[PDB]
UniProtKB/Swiss-Prot annotation, chain A:
Subcellular location: Plastid, Chloroplast thylakoid membrane
Disulfide bridge partners, by residue number: none
Keywords, alphabetical: 4Fe-4S, Chloroplast, Electron transport, Iron, Iron-sulfur, Membrane, Metal-binding, Oxidoreductase, Photosynthesis, Photosystem I, Plastid, Repeat, Thylakoid, Transport
Domain of life according to the entry: Eukaryota
Biological process annotations from GO: photosynthesis; photosynthetic electron transport in photosystem I
Source organism of the structure: Chlamydomonas reinhardtii (Chlamydomonas smithii)
Major localization listed first in the record, in broad terms: plastid
Enzyme class, UniProt record, top EC level: oxidoreductase
Name the record gives this protein: Photosystem I iron-sulfur center
4Fe-4S ferredoxin-type domain mapped to chain residues: 1-30, 38-67
Binding site for [4Fe-4S] cluster 1: C10, C13, C16, C57
Swiss-Prot record, chain D:
Domain of life: Eukaryota
Protein name: Photosystem I reaction center subunit V, chloroplastic
Keywords, ordered alphabetically: Chloroplast, Membrane, Photosynthesis, Photosystem I, Plastid, Thylakoid, Transit peptide, Transmembrane, Transmembrane helix
Principal location listed in the UniProt entry: plastid
Source organism of the structure: Chlamydomonas reinhardtii
Residue ranges the record marks as coiled coil: none
Family classification: Belongs to the PsaG/PsaK family.
Cellular component, GO annotation: chloroplast thylakoid membrane; photosystem I
UniProt subcellular location: Plastid, Chloroplast thylakoid membrane
Curated annotation (Swiss-Prot), chain E:
Name of protein: Photosystem I P700 chlorophyll a apoprotein A2
Assembly information from the UniProt record: The PsaA/B heterodimer binds the P700 chlorophyll special pair and subsequent electron acceptors. PSI consists of a core antenna complex that captures photons, and an electron transfer chain that converts photonic excitation into a charge separation. The eukaryotic PSI reaction center is composed of at least 11 subunits.
GO molecular function: 4 iron, 4 sulfur cluster binding; chlorophyll binding; electron transfer activity; magnesium ion binding; oxidoreductase activity
Effect of D559N: Loss of PSI assembly and function
Organism: Chlamydomonas reinhardtii
Tagged with keyword Cell membrane: no
Physiological role: PsaA and PsaB bind P700, the primary electron donor of photosystem I (PSI), as well as the electron acceptors A0, A1 and FX. PSI is a plastocyanin/cytochrome c6-ferredoxin oxidoreductase, converting photonic excitation into a charge separation, which transfers an electron from the donor P700 chlorophyll pair to the spectroscopically characterized acceptors A0, A1, FX, FA and FB in turn. Oxidized P700 is reduced on the lumenal side of the thylakoid membrane by plastocyanin or cytochrome c6. Both potential cofactor branches in PSI seem to be active; however, electron transfer seems to proceed preferentially down the path including the phylloquinone bound by PsaA.
Name of the gene this protein is made from: psaB
From Swiss-Prot, chain F:
Residues of the full protein shown: 153 to 227 of 227
Name of the protein in question: Photosystem I reaction center subunit III, chloroplastic
Lineage of the species this protein comes from: Eukaryota, Viridiplantae, Chlorophyta, core chlorophytes, Chlorophyceae
Primary role: Probably participates in efficiency of electron transfer from plastocyanin to P700 (or cytochrome c553 in algae and cyanobacteria). This plastocyanin-docking protein contributes to the specific association of plastocyanin to PSI.
GO cellular component assignments: chloroplast thylakoid lumen; photosystem I reaction center
Cellular localization per UniProt: Plastid, Chloroplast thylakoid lumen
Natural source organism: Chlamydomonas reinhardtii
Keywords for the protein's UniProt record, in alphabetical order: Chloroplast, Photosynthesis, Photosystem I, Plastid, Thylakoid, Transit peptide
Length: 80, 194, 37, 95, 733, 75, 186
């Protein structure tokens, strides 16, 4: 399973959640930004490591980071 | 301040004013660190004192007709015996190194443990010239100025001999014979394009 | 005493080039595939 | 050259200066190794191999123990044979 | 889950074939294993080193055994000039009769390979004369191999495992290795030369059976204990001495002749005896420098802490470096590979020009192989030296503990370092390539007098300082009135000057404009390879494109297509790109060495002088001209002894070209292709009964770069090895 | 050697002068793809004295940027 | 405050004086693990015991007129062929030594075959243990003296002593080390 971390520079644009092609991320309430919402990664066991979320994050440096880790059938994206 | 090495210049701050022989000469700011300057202050005096002995010795040998400073140790090579003022000495090179190494180690080692003393006085000033400690300013200035002059002179001995091969007294006689035709501009060595 | 027999290559070359590799590959293939208790 | 005079003579000089000249200086520099601290702090056999288990005490007033005698004597022997060997090269045929 | 690999649960849980590949590739990265501790890390490494030592002595034993069993050493020693050494016998059932006859040579019973490693000249020089001498050495080294293997087992046992602090006793290890490992070993080797090697070179047999009753010198130890050490340098071997015989021999065991033995064209044994005696004294003395349990010596931490320039030019200086070096194995390994890698180059440079083994010079194939062998190994070791320096920064570097010291300040001005290496590489490439192309155009248009030939005056001036009188500089050793010439005129200059002014040997070969261009191409290779490796290390911890690269490790595929694309952004990839430039650099070095020597060995040095100034000459007169015999090893009319090198030559081109596939085409194409193969197997009747246990997948992004680089390197090496040996051996051998 | 350096410094100095000149404009990027020929010709002729101008910038300390005004990566 | 090898040197802590012959001599601190010191103490005796027999054997063989010199005994041919001697020695010594080790592990003392300690005559006490070590150490030093004196002088032990006694100042290590050609040229 890969590791996905959300850092406190998130502005709650939701672009990472929309970009993710496996519904790994979601938005949750927060008080640390104007949007009052923060990205969350509750389902990292389904993450494949495409890093589409990082491509979509506007903040600099990124507020969502993916660290490729142990491989499995789900993370290796196999249908066989 | 003993003067100004470059008239119109500003003396470096890190050079204390009362330091003997202070002309404000430090283009490369080598004495900027106080700890380094303290070591340099001692080394200049020791270098000058050895240079004064060396220049006096080098001139004395040739003035009395015993050769030049450069030829003095040739006896230990060819196979001859040492001579001092024409008086034969019974030692050989390997023996001489023994006395000098032990003797100089004792003296220099004793000086080294003093932790930077450069004006001991006491037994080293039997006649009490600097016993006053208040009028010593001129004597310290006279010592360093003659010391710096001797250091420059000895470099002249080495540099001149490497170019012409003659002794310091012989070189002086040759300059006076033809001042315009016998100088560093006529070596054929010092200035390659002359 | 040291000199090996004149027939040594005939036995050792096939042994180290065809036989031991076969056993080594079989040993390694079984080992990697083996499942933990 | 006579080996007995040269080797013994050089050794005496190096022992004499070591005992009377550089003993104070040498000891001070040895304490600069104390500022860093001990090598290890352990109680295993391999950790014990890095400690001064045996302290070489001496009755000499200045503390010139046997380890110092070996150090300064070795330099004298090394210098002594350098002098003898170099002097031997004089009057050597085809060498 | 699967058992293999036992050291990583992440790999063992992987259901794909990546588990097999990655398990092999992470076996020796002990720091990454599950449950690893620092103390266990050092004990595993200590055990592994015993295994490496046992392999080295077993490999050496195998060489000794096969030469004695199947070689012609006893025949070769009689007439080394006109006999080709035999490496080992051939038993290939695939051979046809013409092949069996072709490889039968040297009076051997059957087919054999000709040796190129020079072990014959080496072993003959050190006193070996019979096959039984080699047999006893082979059994002795096989025993030594066993002992080291046992020691590796012993020190893994409960009561013999050293503690962590034992591996970090720097002062004690340096004292022993300098005085004992270096000093005593060199002192012992002097004993062999005085007692065995030198007498054997004078026709007197000395073995274990009689060496206690044979006097190495007529005056036995009286000169040694009396200080009259000059007695050992009297009556050296005369210029008429015939090696291995007592005619023309002398009596001296320690000399400083300084030249080459006239017959063997190699260094005198009495000089190599005095050499090893001299450094042994220095190394034994140097090994009494550091602190131990006896209250004298230096502590390395004190030395580093002291050396801080008072002006603050180097910041904190070397403060904190002792822990940085003493606690990081990658820092220590980087210093070991950098030092050993440079010394490997030095061995190659000095062995071809100062051949130490009798009759080594006349064996042209051996000399070519030995120089190429060690230069390629040096090149790989240098790349490893920088790789582990890059690994140190990611894994072991601690910014807080290195605050303001020299190491930290290197990262402060890394852009300045990289920018200037970039400028030097560009400058050398532009002008080096430009001058070659200019000279090529002039040759093409038929005006060889219009080309730009720059005389290597600076290098020719160095050769004058060493006594080469061809250039007329009359400088230092080239002038008979200089003090340098006079002082050494009684010790080694007569022999040295005689050898350096002999133009038939490789001691300071004459150089010209052709050597000017090639040397500047070599500089381009060194600077560019350093640029790639140095960037990979200084940027390992992060960069503007990836500020937090340290959090991902030394080797990762990429950071994805975002931010413009980040392919080959890790420090692992900088090393991967630098290997190509290392091969390119060592290739230029070995082409230059080989071509300049082939022309010398044929006597027509003018060919190199004229054709080496433009790049068509290299392609025409070196690569194309010298391939004629190689590619005729087998042809439609038959085959000869070179057919193995002809076959290996194409074998290299194939492995090299196969590497392009892993480097050009990347993973995404192949993973999708494998998915139709998985579909095809499952739907095929009579085959879907059989099934796999590891799900097939394409190689990883990082794996294919290594696999492609491995094929590239292997094909690189095998192609030139076959050409180097075939061109040199067929021409003369 | 000194023939080439004069021309090489001429080309480099002229380009640096033009690059500084357009940095003050509202849209520097559009002044680089579309060259301001009247300005370029003016700077082309004044470059003949680049060695004099280059040295005077060095002594006045305006040749190099300050270390604090240059971006660098984390270290 | 027992006597120590160096005047005015307090013995190191790991040496308590319990062992026989404990003079506090361990400049390298080799014996500091209690598990190794016990092994070394046994190892000291066995090396000394073999040395004591060896020194007596060399002296006894020389005093009884046996030839050739002790360093040429192997070359001489005896009733049993040299090839047959080694297998006999290997089997016999292997048996004695293996049982020698087995008893030491169980009891921690030294013995013979199945008896540990092997003291049939009942002579055993701290004084006897001390006397064994001191005589053992002397034999170990003595044997090395024989080996080196054979190398340099090439004379048997008693033969060398007689030459020294006859001409003390003329004959000594100084003479032999500077006359190897003469002595080895005979
Ligand atoms: C306890 C151990 C022991 C020791 C210290 C020695 C010591 C010695 N033996 Mg001895 N041996 C020992 C046990 C044995 N030896 C032999 C059989 C021999 C023989 C056959 C010879 C020696 C010889 C030697 C000498 C080695 C000279 C040399 O370089 O020849 C080594 C030669 C080669 C490696 C070839 C040396 C005095 C030699 C001798 O007497 O020299 C004149 C000799 O020829 N020994 C046997 C078998 C019964 C032993 C059994 O334990
Ligand atoms: C205690 C035993 C012992 C005794 C009684 C003797 C007695 C004698 N030896 Mg022998 N010898 C010994 C030990 C002994 N040796 C050892 C251990 C060695 C090896 C270094 C030698 C090597 C040797 C040679 C090479 C020669 C003699 C010779 C002689 C004779 C003249 C004396 C001489 O030159 O001595 C001076 C030189 C010596 C080496 C003797 C040293 C004796 C002391 C007591 C040894 C102390 C060892 C010490 C405790 C070890 C500490 C180790 C440390 C790491 C802690 C004389 C009969 C000469 C002769 O004429 O022989 C026929 C001769 O040529 N001996
Ligand atoms: C060191 C490795 C090695 C060895 C020893 C051999 C040996 C042989 N190869 Mg080669 N081969 C090898 C590697 C090797 N190969 C590799 C790596 C490849 C792939 C690149 C090939 C590809 C290859 C091909 C394509 C062919 C050979 C063939 C041969 C035979 C050539 C001589 C002949 O006329 O045989 C004649 C053979 C016989 C008279 C019979 C020999 C004994 C047979 C093969 C086995 C008997 C087994 C026994 C009855 C029961 C088990 C006994 C066992 C448990 C001890 C011979 C058996 C040729 C051949 O004939 O193969 C059969 C052949 O066509 N090889
Ligand atoms: C005198 C005591 C001594 C000795 C002999 C050694 C010896 C060795 N130690 Mg060390 N070691 C010592 C004390 C000693 N150690 C102490 C006191 C400690 C504790 C502080 C250690 C702790 C220690 C560790 C932790 C390790 C070692 C290791 C090693 C081995 C290094 C590899 C090797 O073989 O290099 C051999 C090197 C040379 C012979 C010299 C190489 C350099 C020269 C200049 C090259 C050129 C020479 C010449 C021209 C070549 C000719 C070639 C020929 C073909 C012609 C080596 C066997 C390592 C090892 O492998 O352990 C198994 C290891 O891991 N040691
Ligand atoms: C004595 C020196 C030394 C030592 C002790 C180590 C030790 C280590 N290195 Mg280092 N390294 C060295 C030399 C050394 N290196 C050199 C010389 C280079 C330059 C080439 C490198 C380059 C290097 C890199 C780039 C990396 C390491 C890494 C490592 C670690 C893991 C190694 C591993 O898992 O390999 C496993 C071994 C393999 C997968 C196979 C190795 C064999 C290769 C692929 C070539 C095979 C060729 C083949 C035999 C040819 C067949 C020919 C055909 C005709 C038959 C380990 C701590 C890795 C690490 O984790 O660092 C933190 C890492 O990234 N090293
Ligand atoms: C023959 C093949 C080749 C060539 C010519 C180069 C050239 C270069 N490489 Mg590259 N490289 C190669 C293969 C090659 N590489 C391979 C196989 C790899 C493995 C992936 C790499 C990996 C690599 C790395 C990792 C690095 C380089 C670097 C460099 C530069 C080194 C400095 C230099 O020589 O500057 C002088 C420049 C040249 C010789 C380039 C050719 C110039 C031509 C002749 C100009 C022609 C102009 C003319 C007007 C015609 C134009 C026509 C057109 C408009 C139609 C240079 C641009 C380093 C770099 O960029 O340093 C700054 C660097 O870091 N290379
Ligand atoms: C087989 C040889 C041997 C062995 C194993 C021992 C072992 C021992 N001795 Mg003994 N000793 C020996 C020979 C030996 N000794 C000899 C020949 C002498 C006379 C010079 C002495 C004189 C002596 C004294 C005066 C004392 C000891 C003591 C000790 C104990 C502590 C030191 C230690 O751990 O040493 C371990 C030793 C080794 C592992 C042997 C290392 C040998 C190296 C590798 C080579 C040495 C070459 C040599 C200098 C020439 C230990 C039981 C001390 C104690 O308390 O005893 C009860 C003590 O006070 N020994
Ligand atoms: C370490 C102890 C040791 C060893 C290994 C040897 C070994 C040897 N001795 Mg020596 N010997 C020793 C102790 C030793 N001796 C002792 C303590 C003495 C008493 C003083 C002798 C007295 C002695 C004599 C008188 C002779 C030997 C001889 C021999 C040789 C032949 C032995 C034989 O045939 O035995 C076979 C006999 C038995 C196994 C019966 C033993 C009964 C008790 C052999 C080299 C003989 C020889 O040829 O020397 C050159 C010889 O003449 N030895
Ligand atoms: C008691 C006393 C005293 C006396 C003392 C003495 C007398 C001493 C001595 C001492 C000594 C007398 C010492 C010695 C030492 C020595 C040594 C320590 C040595 C070493 C050596 C070496 C190390 C060597 C080496 C080498 C070799 C081997 C070879 C060649 C090279 C060389 C040389 C390097 C007095 C009166 C003063 C005071 C009071 C008390
Ligand atoms: C990145 C990194 C790293 C790495 C590094 C490296 C890899 C390096 C290398 C380096 C090198 C590889 C270097 C080299 C150098 C060299 C030198 C510096 C030399 C010198 C020489 C000399 C000085 C000489 C002289 C002389 C002559 C010339 C002649 C005569 C004689 C004489 C001696 C006088 C490390 C690990 C640290 C870690 C951190 C990071
Ligand atoms: C032909 C002419 C050749 C002349 C060669 C001269 C060689 C000089 C070798 C000196 C070796 C070191 O010896 C010298 O070390 C220290 C000075 O550096 C002195 O020792 C002192 O030095 C420190 C630094 O100044 C002081 O803070 C301390 O009080 C003390 O450590 C020693 O008392 C002296 O003996």
């Amino acid at each position: 399973a890969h590791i996905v971390k959300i850092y406190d520079t998130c502005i709650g644009c939701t672009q990472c959640v929309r970009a993710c092609p496996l519904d790994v991320l979601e938005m949750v309430p927060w008080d640390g930004c104007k949007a009052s919402q923060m990205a969350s990664a509750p389902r990292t066991e389904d993450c494949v490591g495409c890093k589409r979320c990082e491509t979509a994050c506007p903040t600099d440096f990124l507020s969502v980071r993916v660290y490729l880790g142990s491989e499995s059938t789900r993370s290796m994206g196999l249908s066989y | 301040k003993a003067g100004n090495w470059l008239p119109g210049s500003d003396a470096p701050a890190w050079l204390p004013d009362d330091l003997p022989g202070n002309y404000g000469f430090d283009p490369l700011s080598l004495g900027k660190e106080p700890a380094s300057l303290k070591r340099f202050t001692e080394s200049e005096v020791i270098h000058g004192r050895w240079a004064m002995l060396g220049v006096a010795g080098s001139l004395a040998v040739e003035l009395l007709g015993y050769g030049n400073w450069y030829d003095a140790p040739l006896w230990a090579v060819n196979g001859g015996k040492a001579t001092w003022f024409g008086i034969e000495v019974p030692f050989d090179l390997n023996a001489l190194l023994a006395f000098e190494f032990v003797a100089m180690a004792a003296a220099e080692g004793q000086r080294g443990d003093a932790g930077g003393v450069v004006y001991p006085g006491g037994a080293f000033d039997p006649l009490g010239f600097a016993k006053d400690s208040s009028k010593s300013g001129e004597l310290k200035l006279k010592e360093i100025k003659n010391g710096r002059l001797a250091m420059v002179a000895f470099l002249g001995f080495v540099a001149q001999h490497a170019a012409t091969g003659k002794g310091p007294i012989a070189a002086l006689g040759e300059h006076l014979a033809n001042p315009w035709g016998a100088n560093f501009a006529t070596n054929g060595i010092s200035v390659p394009f002359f | 005493p040291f000199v090996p027999p004149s027939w040594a290559p005939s036995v050792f070359v096939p042994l180290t080039g065809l036989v031991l590799p076969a056993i080594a590959m079989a040993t390694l293939f079984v080992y990697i595939e083996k499942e933990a208790p | 050259l006579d080996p007995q005079i040269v080797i013994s003579g050089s050794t005496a000089a190096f022992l004499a200066i070591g005992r009377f000249v550089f003993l104070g200086y040498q000891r001070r520099e040895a304490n600069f190794d104390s500022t860093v601290g001990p090598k290890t702090t352990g109680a295993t056999y391999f950790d014990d191999l890095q400690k001064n288990s045996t302290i070489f005490a001496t009755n000499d007033p200045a503390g010139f123990n046997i380890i110092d005698v070996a150090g300064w004597g070795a330099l004298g022997h090394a210098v002594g044979f350098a002098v003898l060997a170099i002097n031997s090269l004089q009057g050597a045929n085809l060498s | 889950t699967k058992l293999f690999p036992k050291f990583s649960q992440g790999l063992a849980q992987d259901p794909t074939t990546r588990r097999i590949w990655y398990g092999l590739a992470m076996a020796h990265d002990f720091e990454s294993h599950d449950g690893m501790t620092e103390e266990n890390l050092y004990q595993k490494i200590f055990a592994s080193h015993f295994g490496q030592l046992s392999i080295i002595f077993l490999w050496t034993s195998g060489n000794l055994f096969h030469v004695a069993w199947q070689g012609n050493f006893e025949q070769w020693v009689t007439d080394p000039v006109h006999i080709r050494p035999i490496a080992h016998a051939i038993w290939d059932p695939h051979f046809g009769q013409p092949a069996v006859e072709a490889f039968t040579r040297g009076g051997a019973s059957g087919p054999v390979n000709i040796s190129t490693s020079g072990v014959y000249q080496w072993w003959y020089t050190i006193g070996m004369r019979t096959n039984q001498d080699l047999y006893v050495g082979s059994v002795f080294l096989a025993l030594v191999s066993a002992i080291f293997l046992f020691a590796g087992w012993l020190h893994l046992q409960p009561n013999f495992q050293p503690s962590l602090s034992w591996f970090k006793d720097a002062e004690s290890r340096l004292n022993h290795h300098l005085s004992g490992l270096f000093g005593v070993s060199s002192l012992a080797w002097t004993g062999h030369l005085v007692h065995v090697a030198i007498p054997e070179s004078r026709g007197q047999h000395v073995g274990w059976d009689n060496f206690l009753s044979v006097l190495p010198h007529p005056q036995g130890l009286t000169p040694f204990f009396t200080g009259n050490w000059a007695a050992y340098a009297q009556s050296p071997d005369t210029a008429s001495h015939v090696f291995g015989t007592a005619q023309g021999s002398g009596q001296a065991i320690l000399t400083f002749l300084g030249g080459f033995h006239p017959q063997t064209q190699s260094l005198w044994l009495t000089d190599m005896a005095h050499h090893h005696l001299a450094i042994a004294v220095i190394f034994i003395v140097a090994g009494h420098m550091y602190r131990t349990n006896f209250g004298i010596g230096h502590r390395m931490q004190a030395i580093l802490e002291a050396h801080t320039p008072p002006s603050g030019s180097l910041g904190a200086g070397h403060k904190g470096l002792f822990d940085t070096v003493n606690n990081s194995l990658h820092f220590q390994l980087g210093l070991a590979l950098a030092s050993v890698g440079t010394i490997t180059s030095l061995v190659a440079q000095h062995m071809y020009s100062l051949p130490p083994y009798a009759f080594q010079a006349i064996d042209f194939t051996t000399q070519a192989a030995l120089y190429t062998h060690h230069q390629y190994i040096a090149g790989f070791i240098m790349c490893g030296a920088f790789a582990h320096g890059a690994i140190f920064f990611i894994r072991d570097y601690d910014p807080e503990q290195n605050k303001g010291n020299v190491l930290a300040r290197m990262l402060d001005h890394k852009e300045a370092l990289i920018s200037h290496l970039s400028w030097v590489s560009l400058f050398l490439g532009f002008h080096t390539l430009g001058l070659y192309v200019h000279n090529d155009v002039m040759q093409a248009f038929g005006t060889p007098e219009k080309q730009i030939l720059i005389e290597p005056v600076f290098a020719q001036w160095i050769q004058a300082a060493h006594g080469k009188a061809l250039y007329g500089f009359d400088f230092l050793l080239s002038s008979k009135t200089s003090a340098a010439f006079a002082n050494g005129q009684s010790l080694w200059l007569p022999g040295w000057l005689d050898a350096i002014n002999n133009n038939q040997n490789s001691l300071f070969l004459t150089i010209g404009p052709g050597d000017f261009l090639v040397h500047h191409a070599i500089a381009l290779g060194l600077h560019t390879t350093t640029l790639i490796l140095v960037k990979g290390a200084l940027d390992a911890r992060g960069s503007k494109l990836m500020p937090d690269k340290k959090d991902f490790g030394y080797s990762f595929p990429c950071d994805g297509p975002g931010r413009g694309g980040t392919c080959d952004i890790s420090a692992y990839d900088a090393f991967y790109l630098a290997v190509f430039w290392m091969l390119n650099t060592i290739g230029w070095v070995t082409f230059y060495w080989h071509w300049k020597h082939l022309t010398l060995w044929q006597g027509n040095v003018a060919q190199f002088d004229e054709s080496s100034t433009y790049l068509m000459g290299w392609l025409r007169d070196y690569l194309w001209l010298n391939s004629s015999q190689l590619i005729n090893g087998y042809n439609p009319f038959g085959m000869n002894s070179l057919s193995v090198w002809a076959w290996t030559f194409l074998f290299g081109h194939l492995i090299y070209a196969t590497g392009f596939m892993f480097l050009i085409s990347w993973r995404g194409y192949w993973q999708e292709l494998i998915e139709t193969l998985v579909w095809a197997h499952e739907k095929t009747p009579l085959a879907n009964l059989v099934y796999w246990k590891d799900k097939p997948v394409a190689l990883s992004i990082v794996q294919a770069r290594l696999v492609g680089l491995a094929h590239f390197s292997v094909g690189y090496i095998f192609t030139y090895a076959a050409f180097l040996i075939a061109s040199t051996s067929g021409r003369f051998g | 050697t000194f023939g080439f350096l004069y021309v090489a410094g001429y080309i480099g100095y002229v380009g640096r002068q033009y690059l500084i000149a357009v940095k003050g404009e509202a849209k520097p990027t559009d002044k680089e793809i579309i060259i301001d020929v009247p300005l370029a010709t003016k700077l082309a002729w004044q470059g003949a004295g680049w060695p004099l101008a280059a040295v005077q910038e060095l002594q006045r300390g305006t040749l190099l940027e300050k270390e604090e005004n240059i971006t660098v990566s984390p270290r | 405050a027992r006597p120590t090898w160096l005047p005015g040197l307090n013995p190191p802590a790991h040496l308590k004086g319990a062992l026989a012959g404990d003079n506090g001599f361990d400049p390298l601190g080799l014996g500091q693990d209690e598990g190794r010191l016990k092994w070394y103490a046994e190892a000291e005796k066995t090396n000394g015991r073999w040395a004591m027999m060896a020194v007596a054997g060399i002296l006894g063989q020389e005093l009884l007129g046996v030839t050739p010199a002790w360093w040429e005994a192997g070359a001489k041919e005896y009733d049993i062929p040299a090839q047959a001697l080694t297998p006999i020695e290997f089997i016999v010594m292997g048996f004695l030594e293996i049982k020698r080790y087995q008893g030491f592990k169980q009891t921690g003392t030294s013995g013979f075959i199945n008896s540990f300690p092997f003291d049939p005559a009942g002579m055993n006490s701290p004084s006897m243990a001390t006397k064994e070590v001191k005589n053992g150490r002397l034999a170990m030093v003595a044997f090395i003296g024989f080996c080196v004196q054979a190398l340099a002088t090439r004379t048997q032990p008693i033969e060398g002593l007689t030459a020294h006694l006859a001409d003390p100042f003329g004959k000594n290590i100084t003479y032999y080390l500077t006359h190897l050609p003469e002595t080895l040229g005979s």
